[PDB]
Amino acid sequence: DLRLHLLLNTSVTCNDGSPAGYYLKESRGSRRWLLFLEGGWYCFNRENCDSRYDTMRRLMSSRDWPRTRTGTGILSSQPEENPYWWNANMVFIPYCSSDVWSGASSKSEKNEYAFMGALIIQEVVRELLGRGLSGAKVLLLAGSSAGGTGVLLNVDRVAEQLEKLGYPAIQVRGLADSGWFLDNKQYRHTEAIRRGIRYWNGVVPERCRRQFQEGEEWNCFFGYKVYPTLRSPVFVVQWLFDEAQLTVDNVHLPVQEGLRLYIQNLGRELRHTLKDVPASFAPACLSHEIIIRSHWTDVQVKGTSLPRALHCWDRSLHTPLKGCPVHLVDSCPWPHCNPSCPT
Numbered sequence: 001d002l003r004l005h006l007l008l009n010t011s012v013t014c015n016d017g018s019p020a021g022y023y024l025k026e027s028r029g030s031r032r033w034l035l036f037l038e039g040g041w042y043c044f045n046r047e048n049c050d051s052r053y054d055t056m057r058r059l060m061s062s063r064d065w066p067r068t069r070t071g072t073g074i075l076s077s078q079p080e081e082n083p084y085w086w087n088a089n090m091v092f093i094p095y096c097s098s099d100v101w102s103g104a105s106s107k108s109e110k111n112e113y114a115f116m117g118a119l120i121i122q123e124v125v126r127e128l129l130g131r132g133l134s135g136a137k138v139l140l141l142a143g144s145s146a147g148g149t150g151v152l153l154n155v156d157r158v159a160e161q162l163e164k165l166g167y168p169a170i171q172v173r174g175l176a177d178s179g180w181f182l183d184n185k186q187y188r189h190t191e192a193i194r195r196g197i198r199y200w201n202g203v204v205p206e207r208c209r210r211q212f213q214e215g216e217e218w219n220c221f222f223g224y225k226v227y228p229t230l231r232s233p234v235f236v237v238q239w240l241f242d243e244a245q246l247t248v249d250n251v252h253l254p255v256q257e258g259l260r261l262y263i264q265n266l267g268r269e270l271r272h273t274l275k276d277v278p279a280s281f282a283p284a285c286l287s288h289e290i291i292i293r294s295h296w297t298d299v300q301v302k303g304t305s306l307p308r309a310l311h312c313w314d315r316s317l318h319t320p321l322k323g324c325p326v327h328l329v330d331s332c333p334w335p336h337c338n339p340s341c342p343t
């Protein structure tokens with residue numbers, strides 16, 4: 001179990017002003033720290049956020065959070081469930097800012113909600129330094145869906161504060177799971193995100209912001225556009241046929257030729273955006289499954305599981321390694337052509 005700690009700086013809050021926090025299970029003796037960003041979409045205006053507060057309040061408030069949580073998947077401490085970092089210090093950061101981890105705006109007389117996702121990450125890191133993070137060799141910032149995009153938006157800022165805070169020895173790396181999206185045409189019929197960013201006062205990485213410039217920061221929410229601007233090593237996990245991608249594309253699954261070509265082209269576009277991502281794991285599956293599920297070990301690409309690929313990535317960060325690959329992108333063109341896809 002990971003134990004809840006509400007942030008000591010109570011000005012860094014969830015949407016409704018309650019304190020943000022993190023769940024922590026220390027593994028002393030281990031110099032590895034895994035900080036996982038929870039996902040859960042976002043909200044982009046007052047009415048849309050009001051609706052999320054009725055029926056998704058845990059994503060907007062810490063008032064009802066549990067004491068503890070069980071680490072699962074990559075957050076598990078059992079070596080059978082987590083061959084990769086079972087012995088690491090485990091941190092689960094709940095998503096309660098509804099801003100894809102990009103916000104830096106408080107509640108005020110003018111703001112019904114606070115959007116502080118970018119500041120929550122900074123404050124968690126700062127408070128963890130007094131709890132052993134100061135001794136880390138590697139800080140892996142990981143996350144799924146909205147948290148996966150959050151990794152891409154925040155990994156370089158975490159590296160920056162640790163350097164500014166006087167900890168240049170900590171190697172900051174990113175693991176973005178299911179947060180790598182395409183701004184493509186729907187099969188049948190960006191604006192919510194563009195409206196979201198203005199509503200949250202959202203912030204994007206500095207190099208990406210300087211390329212796309214004022215009013216175009218939404219581009220930095222798309223992995224293939226923000227990734228090349230990043231300095232920290234980032235491993236990208238993305239289903240070729242991600243269910244959230246297909247949902248926003250208005251695809252729900254006999255398939256006729258128009259939809260067949262659309263689905264096949266989407267997988268190829270995906271595959272193409274990962275061509276120059278050296279550390280990646282992209283199985284040809286239709287799925288919404290994420291890396292904190294207990295059976296995350298089962299999927300393989302070209303015979304290599306994700307826990308193995310991540311270990312090979314670790315070795316690469318000490319010229320490809322014999323028998324221990326890091327770039328694993330399926331080439332077959334249809335959902336579940338890979339026999340190991342989740343059922």
Ligand SMILES: Cc1ccc(Sc2ccc3n[nH]c(=O)n3n2)cc1
Nearest residue numbers: 039040041100145146149181221244
């Ligand atoms: C471009 C972009 C748009 C939305 C998000 S946020 C998101 C996207 C999928 C998804 N599936 N399940 C879940 O919670 N999410 N959240 C991130 C980037």
